[PDB]
């Protein structure tokens, strides 16, 4: 039907334009020479790549990018798993789903990080994990975990009951039923939790800025913020924009592969 095709065409170009224009503006702030990054024009002229080769001069950004990949992936892998176990418990099992467990799970996400980070600093001073991946992945997982447990519970609670009756009748042990019956039907929930947790880790600041100080654990979201420039007071705008256009690409590549699974 030519009407149905025309309607979806105009809606698709409207949505792509609506979402991407503020990203195209960031790309134009990246590509303009510093003589005209203040010119007021959306479409650039006299384009220069100088701002990318500025941030890539020396390993200080590229190491922070590698750290952000490692910490981001290990956070989503572990938090989806231990959030998955806990979510399946509250969703299907008889007694762990006590309103206390959801109560404490909310309290971790309900309370501001701004207070918590100083007690966390003086812990990692003691334990010795400070300015290293474990002492940064650990708080990441703790503050990610409420979203994973609460989200995945709200999907596992919706897989129809006679599939679980059939799994009992077909003699399957509960972990094997979870593997072969529950998780394949709940896959949009799994994928959504993995995306939301990865993107949460991939641009966190208050913890990463406080619990790191050297290339051993500094991460792209802070290494883009602390860029140098021509002065103590002048904002390095083309370097900030060039940083965002690099640091967003993993957040495209991860989504592009995983969104294949989201279908009914």
């Amino acid at each position: 039907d030519a009407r149905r095709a025309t309607w979806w065409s105009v809606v698709n170009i409207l949505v792509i334009v609506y979402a991407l224009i503020p990203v195209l503006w960031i790309l134009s702030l990246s590509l303009k020479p510093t003589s005209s990054v203040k010119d007021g024009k959306l479409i650039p002229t006299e384009i220069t790549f100088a701002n990318y080769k500025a941030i890539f001069s020396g390993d200080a950004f590229t190491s922070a990018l590698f750290n952000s990949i490692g910490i981001g992936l290990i956070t989503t892998i572990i938090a989806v798993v231990i959030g998955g176990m806990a979510a399946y418990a509250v969703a299907r099992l008889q007694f762990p789903g006590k309103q206390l467990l959801i109560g404490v799970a909310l309290l971790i996400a309900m309370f501001p990080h701004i207070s918590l980070v100083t007690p966390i600093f003086n812990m990692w001073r003691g334990i010795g994990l400070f300015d290293t991946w474990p002492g940064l992945i650990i708080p990441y997982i703790t503050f990610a975990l409420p979203l994973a447990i609460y989200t995945l519970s709200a999907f596992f609670r919706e897989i129809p009951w006679d599939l679980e009756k059939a799994a009992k009748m077909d003699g399957a042990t509960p972990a094997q039923a979870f593997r072969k019956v529950i998780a394949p039907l709940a896959a949009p929930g799994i994928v959504t939790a993995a995306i939301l947790v990865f993107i949460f880790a991939w641009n966190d600041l208050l913890l990463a800025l406080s619990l790191t100080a050297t290339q051993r654990a500094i991460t792209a979201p802070v290494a883009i913020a602390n860029f140098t420039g021509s002065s103590q007071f002048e904002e390095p705008t083309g370097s900030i924009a060039a940083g965002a256009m690099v640091i967003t690409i993993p957040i495209i590549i991860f989504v592009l592969i995983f969104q294949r699974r989201i279908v009914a």
């Binding site: 509250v90 701004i114 918590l116 997982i141 609460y150 999907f155 939301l196 979201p221 940083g243």
Partner: protein, 285 residues
Amino acid sequence: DDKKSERRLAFWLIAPAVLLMLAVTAYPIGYAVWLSLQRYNLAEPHDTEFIGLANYVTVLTDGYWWTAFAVTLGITVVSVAIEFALGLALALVMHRTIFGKGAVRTAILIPYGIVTVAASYSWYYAWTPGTGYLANLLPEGSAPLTDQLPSLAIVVLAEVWKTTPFMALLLLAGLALVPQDLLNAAQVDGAGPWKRLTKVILPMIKPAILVALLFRTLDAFRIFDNIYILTGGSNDTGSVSILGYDNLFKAFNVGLGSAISVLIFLSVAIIAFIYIKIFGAAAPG
């Protein structure tokens, strides 16, 4: 027996989560509460004593808290209403659309994957006149960041564009549940394209939209980046997370900057309580 074995399995099954939440977070919460009862200052940690409830009355009685609170509440309800109404629309076109769905599914989620500092500077340079591409569309000398209602409107937009993909994705993932035959059974029973949404789609996804609404709202109340970078603390529009930071990180009054954290925790807890008790289909139900 099943029940004796299922609780025994269940206690294994929650074990890593409750341990990892408790062992890391119990001391920070306990210390952040306990500092609230005392005249602690980070510049003289030995010169400190218990002050009782005085750190609560001294914030709760102050017009700086109420002005910041009123702004964070007004920004919260207006942004969440727009982001939810838009969120449904974006979830539906991300679900139904015939035209190569991976293009929309990536292009509509990439805003969430832009770094919060670059996003805030993107909007800040976009709205300064003679220098921002959409600021030049205004009449002469407009400069809308300079005064209260237009700068509040700009931060609502700078929030809606960046976080409507969060709710659109939970809406999409929840909406992928709904059995197509119950939609067909509405359609041949004469339900229109909107009449089925309000009476078949929404009431079946109700427990999933609670998650989207809740975690989104509890995040919106603690706004900071998009109203510190863009128009940093000007013409009275400071959100309460900025009020907390300004009394802690750049004043060292730990004994009060902790009270200004406990009170946003309480106010956010009332919103959390109301959402779960009005929905009823919540996680422990």
